[PDB]
Each structure stands twice: as C-alpha cells, then as structure tokens.
RNA sequence: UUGAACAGAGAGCAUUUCCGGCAGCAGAGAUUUCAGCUGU
C-alpha cells in the first residue's frame, strides 16, 4: 500500500485556500478510498513494466562520458541497434529537416531544394520519394505515416501515403514550422508571416488564425502535455498560444536577440530555449520560473531537443551535445562544458559528437528507441544515445509494432475521440471544474449642538 | 484484456516476496516477464495444453526456488505470509482453467488430480470431490476414472458407503466393460476381507458374506451376456437360425472365458471362506 | 565503460505463431497518457450522443388490442411474460408477451371491467395446478367478481375447463381489486371496501372508514397484510389485516388515482393523483411526502414501481408516460406516440426492463425502460464498454454541453405548450408570493412536500 | 429460469447448464433472435456439463427409437440421474429444457422433481446448440456427428420400413 | 477512410478527408487534368487575370457612359482580348463576365491549339512533342507549354524542319522532298 | 462551456466536487482491477429471471 | 404448522477445539515428499 513511486501517479486537486451531511460524508469517504486504491494499484504496475531504460556509466575516473565515440558505441551495443543507427548520404539537395512519426516507425526527410522522402527507416521500405522542385522547408506526419504535410515555397501541401498530392492549402501563406497535435487532429502552422494557424485535418476546416504581431516566427514547439504552442520571436520572447484566445496565453522574455529553438519536455514541466545571444535557458513551464541560464555558449545553439527520458540535446552547428539530468531545479544541474578541477557538482555533457563537415539542420529523438536523429547538410545520421528513449511504451496509445488492421481501427477510434480545439488550456485539468467566478459555495436559495438637538423633529 | 487482470493479480505475492527479503526487484521482474509470456499464450487464440503444462512446470520451478531461497536466506521453512501458498493456488487455478478449456485430455485431468492429492493437508478432499464430480460428468464412459475415484475414496479414506455408490453409478453408466465388474467384485471382496479381519483382530485382542460378490457376479453374467448379444448383431436381427445359434454360442464362450478369469483371480483372496 | 541500450528483441512484441494475438504492453504513466480530463469528457459526450441516437424504446404493441380502450392491467408476480388486460366493453384477455399474443379472451362482464388481478387460489379442498393453469379474477360495475382459470403452455409435464370457476357477488358495484400475496385473500373496493377469500362466496369483513366510497386498492408486497386505498373524498386510507381494521387516513387536495407500494422498502408507497404529480409517502409518517414527482401536465392516471424499487413509471391523462428516478423528483424519460391516447394503466414488468402501458384507443404497448438498452446477451468487451459509458455519463452529468443533450426529448405540441404556460404561471406566482412575503409579517415557509396534505387523522407528535 | 438443457444427438446425450437466461419478453426482437446465430454470444448462454456417448450403433438405434416415440431410455435415466440435482417434488422443481413436449411426461414419470419446458425459449436454445454443434462439445466425442447422423438415419429408416436384405 | 458505420455516419457527418469546402469542387485539378498543365499555380495565375479583367470591367461599368476615356478603354480591352483570341468575337461587355473563363485562357495555350488543328492527336502527345522541341511559331522554337498564342499566330504553328516526324509524314504521303533538307 | 456553471447538488463546495472528479476511471489510467471496480454499476440484475420483492428474517 | 429418526449437500456462519513448532522411532510411495505415538 505504501508504493515508493506513487507521486508520479498522484493527481492534484482544488483546495479552499468536515461536513454535517451523512450521505455526502460517506460518499466523499468512498471517493477518497477509491482514489487511494486507484493510485496504489496503478503504481504497482512498475513490476509489470517489461524493459529497462538504457544508460552508459563511466566505471572509472579517467573515463569521461562525453569523449565516448559513436563507433565505440556501435561496437559495444547489439547488431539490431547498430543497424538502427543509420546514415543516409544525400548530397545534392539541401540540408535535410528530419521528422519521425510519433511511434518511431517512419522517417520523413525534406531537402531544402526539393527532396521529400517518407520511408520506413528500420526496414528498407520507402513509400514516398517526391521531388518538389521549389524550396521546401519542413514537414510532419499527420496522424499516421499515411498522410504528411510539407511546407513548400509558399503554400503548405498535404500528401497521402504514396505521395499523391491531396491538398494545397490556400491559407498558411508562408509556413516554416509545422507541427501536428495528435489528440486534437490539428495541423499548426507558423512562419515568415506573423501568423499562427490551426487547421483541423479531419474536417478540413481552418480553426484559428492568430496574429503573433511580432514578425516572423523564429522557433516553434508544442507542449505535449497541454497542446499549447510555444513560439519564439525576434524579440527574445517566447509566447504560449491556444486556438481559443486571440492573444497569447503567456509571454515570456526568454533571451536577448531572437529565439533560435524551443523544446518542451513530454511531462510539460520544462522548456529549453536557445537564443541567438549564445544563451541556453531552462524554464519551468507550470510556475514560469527560470531554472537555468547557460550564457556564453561558444556559438549560438541552433537546435534543442528533449528526449522522453529527459535528456537535453543542444546543437551548435557542427556539434551535438547532450546533457543528462539538466532539467532539474538545483544549481548543480546547470549544464556545464567542463568540470573545473573535477567538481562532481557540475553537469558536464552526457555525450557529444562533432559533424565535422557540416552544420546540422535539426534534431529529433527517435521516440521509443535509444537514438537521436540529426538531419544536416548531407542527409541523415542517427546517433546511439543510450539514455534517450522510453523503454516501456504503452501499446494502446501508440505502438511501434502496429499492423495494418491496428492502424485502421486506431485511426477510426482516435478520430472518434478527437478533442475539440476549445479544450486547449494552459492546464489540462480545468475542464471538469466550475468557473472561477460563480461562488465556490453552492447556494441554497435561502441566501438567494444643544439647540439643534431641540430643533430635531423639524 | 484478461492477461492484464491475471498479471496484476500476481502482484501482491511479489509485494510480499520482496518485503520478505528473499527475492530482489530485478529478478522478480524477470519472473514477471516469463509469467507475462505464459499468461498471454494461455488466454490468447491458438492455445495449447502444452502451454498450460509448461506454465505449471515454470510455476512449480519458481516455487521450489522460492522454498530453497527461503531456507537459505531467512532460515525458516515458511514465512507464514502470502508468498508460500499463492503460487500453489496459482498452479491450481492454471489447472482449473486448462481443464475448463480443453476437457478432453485425461493426461491433464490426471495431472490435476495428482497435484491436488499430493498438495497434502493444505488441500480439501471436497475440493478433490468437486473435480472428480465434473470429470466423471464429462467422461462417464471412460471407466478408469470411476476406478480411480473409488480407489482414492477407499484406499485412502476408507469410505465404504461412498465407494459402493461410485461403483454402482459407474455400473449404471457403462454396464458393458468387464473391467468395472471385476474391480467391483475386487472391492467387495476387499471390504468383506477387512470386515472379517477386524473381527479376527478384535477376537485376538479382546451373516454378512461373499454373497454380495456372488450377487454382483450373477448380474455381471446376465448383463454382460445381454450387452454382448446386443453389441454383436448390431442393427437388426436379420440373420437365420444358424447365425442366431452361432451368436448365442459365441456369447456363451465370451461370458465363460470372463468367468474363467474371475476364478483365476478369485483364488488369491484366501482369508474368507 | 559499461553501456546498455534498449533491446526490444521482437519475440515479446510480435508473436511467433500467426494464430495468436499481439502483446499489448501497458505503461500507466500520466506522461504517456496526457489529456485525461478532455479524453473522457469527449467519451462521455459521445456516450450521450450515442444514447440519444440509440433511444428506440417502442418494442411493439401486443395482439390487436381491445375494442374499447384498456382500463385494467395486471401482471402476475411470479411469471415473467404473462399479462392480463381488461377493457371498457367487459372483455378481459390473458397475454403471452413473448409471442405478443393472447392465451385466451373472455367476455367477462357487461359493464366496464373496473379491476382485475391474478391469484394462486389457496383452496383447501382442491390443489392449485399452477404449472398449467393461471388464475385471474376481475370485478366490474355489474356487481360481480369472477375468477377465471387459463390454460398455459409453459411446462410440458402433463398430457381442460378454462373459464369461470366461481362467481362472487356483491349488492353494489365494485371499483378496484387486489389480491393478497398469500392465504387465498383479496380485497375489492367500490361503494365500500370488502375483504374476501376464494372459498367463501361472501365478504369476510367490511373494512370501511366512513360512508364514502373507495376508488382504488393495492396490497403491500412485503408485509403483505397492509392494504391501502383511495377514496373519492380525496382520501388515502391504510388498512391492517392483523387488526382487521383501518389504520390511518390522510386527506389531500385532489383525488388519488392510484397507489403502488415499494417492493424493496415495504413501508413506502407512491400515490398518483389529479394535480399533475406523484407523491412518495412513508407509511410511518404521512404528514409529509418524501418525494414529489412533478413533470406531468395533466392528471396522473397510474403509477408503478420497478421491481428493483429504484424507479417508477407514471402514465397520465396527457397522452404520455414518464419514468422517474426515485431520488430525484423530475422525469428521467418521457414516452409518447401520436397513436397513444390517454394512458390509463401502466405496469413495470418483472424483468425491470420493459414497461407495459394500456391506453384508451384499445392498445397495450411494450416499451423499454432504458430506451438505448438492447436485450441481447453481451460479450465482456461490449458489457465493459456500456458500463464504462454509464459511469462516464454519470460523472460528467452536469456539464452544460452534455446536459443539454441528455435532457433533450421531443414532446408533443400540446404538452410543450402546456409546459411553457405552466412555467410562466409558476414563475408569476413565485413573483407574487415573493412580493407578499416582502411586505407581510408572518408568512410560514411551507415545504413542497407538505403543500398537498390538507389533513391527517391520528396526529403526529 | 431454464436451468438445464437436454440435447439428444446420434453420438449420445448431452446435458448443458444454462448460464444466462435469454430474454423472455424481448424474445422476438432482432438482437435476441440473432444472438443464437453469433457463437461469441451463444457461449455466454450455454455451457456443457455432461456428455454420455453411446455404446455403438445398436444402442444408438435403440435410443433413436425411444427418443422418437417419446420414452426415457436407460442411458437417459443414467445421465439425468447423474446430472440433475435432487430438487423437491412439491416446491421449486429443477427445470430441464427439452425439445419434445411428449418426452416431458416420460421424464417427470421417472424424476418427479423435474419440470420440463419446451416452449419457444427452450426451442431456440435447442436450435442454438443444434446450429453450433461440434463447437460446444470442446472436442469430447469420438466420431464425426454428421457421419453418425448418416448411419443413424439409414438404420432408423430401414428399421421403420422393415427393410429385409433377403 | 473506413466507410463508417451508421451510428458513425450520424455521429460525424461533416468529416471528409478528400474534398473540403475551399476546394471549390477541385476545379483547378479538373481543368489541369483536362488541358494537361505541367506545373501547379498556372491555374491561379490565370484566375488572377480573370479577376483583374472582371474588376476593371466592373469599374469601367462604374464610370458614366459618356466619357471617351471609359469608352476608349473598354473598346481597347475588348479588342486586345479578341487579339489574344481569348474571345471568339467582339460582342457585349457582359461577355467579360459570362465568357471569359480560365478554361478559355487555357484554350489559347499552345498544346491545345495543336490538338485543335490536329497537329498532334492528343494534348499529352502535344506536350511530348513540344518538350522534345519540334514546333515553332514563326521563326523561333517553343520549349515550354506555357506559351499561349495570339489570334495572329494560329497560322504559323508549324514544326521545325529536320523534325523527323515531319519527315515521316512527308514520306507517308511520299511528297518527301529532300532538297529542302527535310 | 467545458466547466460547469455552479456546484451541482449533492456537494457543498467545489473542493468536494473536484475531489470527486480528480481521478480518471479510464482503462489507460487505472489498472484493470481498479477499472472494473470503478465501472461496475450499483444495480446489477440478472437478464432473464423474475425479481421478487424483498423478504427479511422475521421483518 | 411442528417433532422424530434416517439419508445427505458443499451451497452458507462462528471461535480459540486442534494442526500448518522440534526431535526419537517405526510405517508410505517414487534420494525427495508422505503418514502417528512421548515431551519441549
């Protein structure tokens, strides 16, 4: 009943800053008993969890972890993971924006010149290779490998599984950043116009057009927790947006200069933003505190990414550098680059790699595996990062081994339980409650000159 | 899914089995992933009684390892907590599930009965009675189950009334195999021999005869003759009197050969008259 | 340097043999499953919409009805599918509700058959053959109570002189009848309420409070020796058969059309009366109703309890029936039909799943108590989905978007217009009593549950 | 309540135990009428508790004639006395569902504590187990049921017509 | 996407992954499958032209019917749209909303007039021939199919000489002169 | 419109009412046993047999 | 409606009546488990 890992499974509630009703008293007592039983029994599943997370540990004081080479990892790990660590050398079209499907089964690469390829990177099956000879910028899958949206010269296009064009969106005028919201079925679009557009993929209907009013959108990320969009502008300002409010939900002053990249944890708690002022900044999202401010990077961080197990992958051109346990509150988790004299209270890099020829275009962790796919000027490279993936997925949220029938039925079922775009709030648990107006107690309709003293009476 | 239900029914015993400091978390996760494999193979499609049997063998092996580790770590022979009966209860439930799914392999039914009998004082003889009742309901014609049921309830419990009831019900169902007749006359001779030997013993310390065996001998001859004349010449009596007398002669040969075997294994009961 | 990656191994996740299903590993982290309020809000909304499209409650009418409108119905409380109905032209019929067809019809009387019930007649010379004969008895305004037997094909044990085994006789007319659930006894109300047993051809006892007639009668179902009756002086009288006497009566504002006792609580009953609502009364304290079920718009003609004791059905003179949860006090459901006129009798079948209504065009109709509920047997996946959806609609019940959908029905034009003028009338009298209370000194706050009792014999202390 | 079910067939006798009652009032509805066609829901109603197979085609023909003319044979007596609980004869008999309204009297003549039902509910329960057949029996009979049906039909017909091969 | 069940057709009806509201019935896709347009955005760079001429025809309708600036510019626009052959006659200014079509401004393209005067036999083979570089309008070769013609140049659509399909049709009719090198 | 207008009847304040709503009963968020305990209804009848009135041990 | 003896079912409910403690010893089945006497 005690369960040393309950507070992961606990659930916050409302507080005022007991009752005389017998029936209501016993009803609330049954509700508290059921909540305790449910938390305990849900937290006892960690016995049933099949796999264990990966790691790499130094076992010596001369053996630092950032100086461990990718060939040495590929020798030290098994043949299946060594074959997952792919490398495509696609030289002639431009730097390749990488994208993985939400289970790690499909890869979607876009060249800057025109070359968009959707493929099953772990078999050898490509299912779309289309050369759209205008400058493409980004792409994403929608709810499947079966549809993907590409952001072209101006218009965003939507292609089916084999690459036939389904849609040319006449809105979404100049996208540079696309991201799909999978529980809400919303393709979110931002770019050189100062506008943020939410487009419902299922109905086909443009849900929202929002003026950023801050020029072109330099970075864009999605909170996986509550589906609000963090856009980074040329002010050094991140703004958190929802498709209901025509104003940003929050505006944070992250950096000086512009904001080069944003990444959010999948728990929706931490956000790493890199500015062009050579400054990485780790942010608390829920309480909006600034946790860490790594200033004076040697060159501006062009990308950040956060794995499912909380690694932090920063990329500064040729270099990729990953820190472990950097998204924590304490000042001993501030990511350093060296430990001055061997200080154990300095978060040196967990591992680093140098793409010596080129400058990396973007970063993306492969979802349920221990790999980091970085797309760069001459194609794709996966890196075996051992701490970097949820070993125990849930197979009824999203399954890496899913079949054709399972894809069909899961598509219909998630389409059926698509969440409305109005339910996107800054916290997800605020659509069962009562108003923050409409008084917290329910109402019971019962509650619904001594002369002048004489001259008074006149 | 129901594999999820069974797998999370398995968790309180390993709660207790980690608290009693004999197993660790990394090895109990290994026994849970093996048990996950087995539960999924059990309640998925295309299932096999060999999947049931291998699950029972795995659960008995982890029970023996648990007993060995308990004696080596805690130096007691049972912790008198949940984790010393839960796994035998699991084996009994795997047996019950398997016999409800494939009630056709008497090898598995008899492995169930053997494990349930050999469980010892912890089981209940009415729990053995229940699975004898449903097995005899499903296989009334298979006669070795009747012999085994009555043999368990006479040669272990010495319950003469219930043993007589079992033999009379079996002879009601299949009064055609002579083996059940011979085991009934064997049981009646054993019962009357134990009766007269307890008489001799109470005499030496301090009416009811083999005529029961003779009467069941008489109805054995009559009904075995009737069932052989009904079994051979099967559909109709379309046979002339040559074939009818040939048949009746052959049933006399059959029945008299069985009575020859009756006297041949009747001579060795030499403690009564 | 030690090193370990994720080894997925493909034997645990995609099965070896093709005949068996794939493994579904679970991981109960809320990080893995993010939108836990919105996702089950949308499942509760899709459950309310699925209920509003699956609501097909009309099963079928049974037989061809009667000729002159059904004024009496009685289920038998031991068999599931048998039903006796009588009309205004004196014909009674016994029904198999499985095949929806009459076992037998009977020209029983000449007037209206004003009551009928069913019996297991405890004769002490003969033995009742209840596996092949059913027994219904029935009183009319031609001063007769007649007892009939029915040949029933429900067991195949046997292989016969069906109708009218005896004829009780009164000097004045009868108006209601109900049978005791043991000991050969019944009671008939009329010009005066008499008790009878099936052996004697005359009333055992006359149990009348005063010289005011009796319009309806119900025996209790447990504590079977407690009777209740409705008299046309707006009176509800309780009788006890140990003391062989009346017990206590109350006088209300308007006339109680019917009673039914709670089969699970043994001292609670529900009255159905002419101001358009029903009253849930405790026998041990008749000074206050313990519920009022309000949503009808004309005089409530008949009420009945679910055999689970948890909800009531209530048919009224506006041509519609209404089902009420017992703890709420407003209608959970309304059933209407352009063909159904003036539902005079409603029973709740012993399955607790179907509702029998007898209208006055002639027809007796089956309905589902839960409209969206089908009567097949269910695999565990669909049974689990259905009770998950019930719990989810229950805990999101009061959200405005799903409340406006679950609250929605199509009511006829006449009932809708009477409903809205009833609303503006009630709002006007609340406005005027608020003004009068603002001025005057001592205006007592009378409860709604007491606002309909004009008085009570044997006062409470 | 339709508690037990007796299905006669050429391989022997089967006693099933009714788990869930089907609907009585909604017995003519569409879902109730096609749940006996779906096997995944019929196995929620019916469970096999006993099957006594015959001793051969001779006892098969004897029991086919006894079932045909509505009599309880000795194998019927054995399996019913094994399977049905010793209920009372005056209060709450055990309920057996048959398909033959003139076999019912022969069953109550032998077991007075058994009331027998063959109305439309027992009829469609019986035709559910006829529709599915070999799947309900879980593998416990020798001999294919249609092959025994061919043999028993030919034997019954030649007996009824007195077919002589002379 | 799954040909949804009935409680499915009812619960969500406006879902359609294939055809949205703003597709306008996929008329761009339909007319470029008809007249076989190579790249995208040609439809909309014709539709902008159609919208511009109906907008300035609207504001020429706005101006009063007496001034020579208005009447000279509408007769000039009508004569230029006749001179590029978008129209077939010099009729009413109501035809500048009834008869100007993105279809007809595709009718003036070079492969479709080629199929019209039977130089090719299908528009696809016309685009084959003019990507292979066989034809010319007057002196100069035409490589792209986006060159639409004017009303004067439907007479000098001819192949080049040394075009071997021209040589094959000459040796078909065995009028094949070879002093003129084709 | 995704949050209720006032506090519904059986509760007295929104702390009580949101303590009712604080745990999801879904398959995805509870174990299988806890999911079954949370979704079984209060009134469980048998689908084809008669419900008789209650009888108590001597009232 | 009760009482009596008889035949039972495994389908319910208590509670300190004993056992799931240790040997010595013979017995039981295939070197492991199984079955009772004298005291802790």
Curated annotation (Swiss-Prot), chain A:
One of its GO terms (cellular component) is nucleolus. Residues 1-11 have a biased composition (Basic and acidic residues). One of its GO terms (biological process) is endonucleolytic cleavage in ITS1 to separate SSU-rRNA from 5.8S rRNA and LSU-rRNA from tricistronic rRNA transcript (SSU-rRNA, 5.8S rRNA, LSU-rRNA). It is found in: Nucleus, Nucleolus. Keywords: Nucleus, Repeat, Ribonucleoprotein, Ribosome biogenesis, rRNA processing, WD repeat. Pfam families: BING4CT, WD40. InterPro entries: BING4_C_dom (IPR012952), WD40/YVTN_repeat-like_dom_sf (IPR015943), WD40_repeat_CS (IPR019775), WD40_repeat_dom_sf (IPR036322), WD40_rpt (IPR001680), WDR46/Utp7 (IPR040315). PROSITE patterns: WD_REPEATS_1, WD_REPEATS_2, WD_REPEATS_REGION. Involved in nucleolar processing of pre-18S ribosomal RNA. Interacts with snoRNA U3. Interacts with MPP10. Component of the ribosomal small subunit (SSU) processome composed of at least 40 protein subunits and snoRNA U3. Present with 5800 molecules/cell in log phase SD medium. This is U3 small nucleolar RNA-associated protein 7. The lineage of its organism: Eukaryota, Fungi, Dikarya, Ascomycota, Saccharomycotina. The gene is UTP7.
UniProtKB/Swiss-Prot annotation, chain B:
Keywords: Nucleus, Repeat, Ribonucleoprotein, Ribosome biogenesis, rRNA processing. It comes from the Eukaryota. GO terms for molecular function: identical protein binding; snoRNA binding; U3 snoRNA binding. GO terms for biological process: endonucleolytic cleavage in 5'-ETS of tricistronic rRNA transcript (SSU-rRNA, 5.8S rRNA, LSU-rRNA); endonucleolytic cleavage in ITS1 to separate SSU-rRNA from 5.8S rRNA and LSU-rRNA from tricistronic rRNA transcript (SSU-rRNA, 5.8S rRNA, LSU-rRNA); endonucleolytic cleavage to generate mature 5'-end of SSU-rRNA from (SSU-rRNA, 5.8S rRNA, LSU-rRNA); maturation of SSU-rRNA; maturation of SSU-rRNA from tricistronic rRNA transcript (SSU-rRNA, 5.8S rRNA, LSU-rRNA). The keyword RNA-binding does not apply. It is found in: Nucleus, Nucleolus. HAT repeats lie at residues 86-118, 123-155, 158-190. One of its GO terms (cellular component) is 90S preribosome. Present with 7520 molecules/cell in log phase SD medium. Component of the ribosomal small subunit (SSU) processome, or 90S pre-ribosomal particle, composed of the 35S pre-rRNA precursor, the U3 snoRNA, and at least 40 protein subunits. Component of the PWP2/UTP-B subcomplex composed of DIP2, PWP2, UTP6, UTP13, UTP18 and UTP21. Interacts with U3 snoRNA. Interacts with MPP10. Belongs to the UTP6 family. Component of the SSU processome, a pre-ribosomal particle required for the maturation of the 18S rRNA from the 35S pre-rRNA precursor. This is U3 small nucleolar RNA-associated protein 6.
Swiss-Prot record, chain D:
Transmembrane segments: none annotated. It comes from the Eukaryota. It is found in: Nucleus, Nucleolus. Interacts with NOP1 and NOP58. Component of the ribosomal small subunit (SSU) processome composed of at least 40 protein subunits and snoRNA U3. Present with 13500 molecules/cell in log phase SD medium. Required for 60S ribosomal subunit synthesis. Belongs to the NOP5/NOP56 family. This is Nucleolar protein 56. It comes from Saccharomyces cerevisiae (strain ATCC 204508 / S288c) (Baker's yeast).
UniProtKB/Swiss-Prot annotation, chain F:
The chain holds residues 841 to 899 of 899 of the full protein. Present with 1470 molecules/cell in log phase SD medium. It comes from Saccharomyces cerevisiae (strain ATCC 204508 / S288c). The lineage of its organism: Eukaryota, Fungi, Dikarya, Ascomycota, Saccharomycotina. Involved in nucleolar processing of pre-18S ribosomal RNA. This is U3 small nucleolar RNA-associated protein 14. It comes from the Eukaryota. Interacts with snoRNA U3. Interacts with MPP10. Component of the ribosomal small subunit (SSU) processome composed of at least 40 protein subunits and snoRNA U3. It is found in: Nucleus, Nucleolus. Belongs to the UTP14 family.
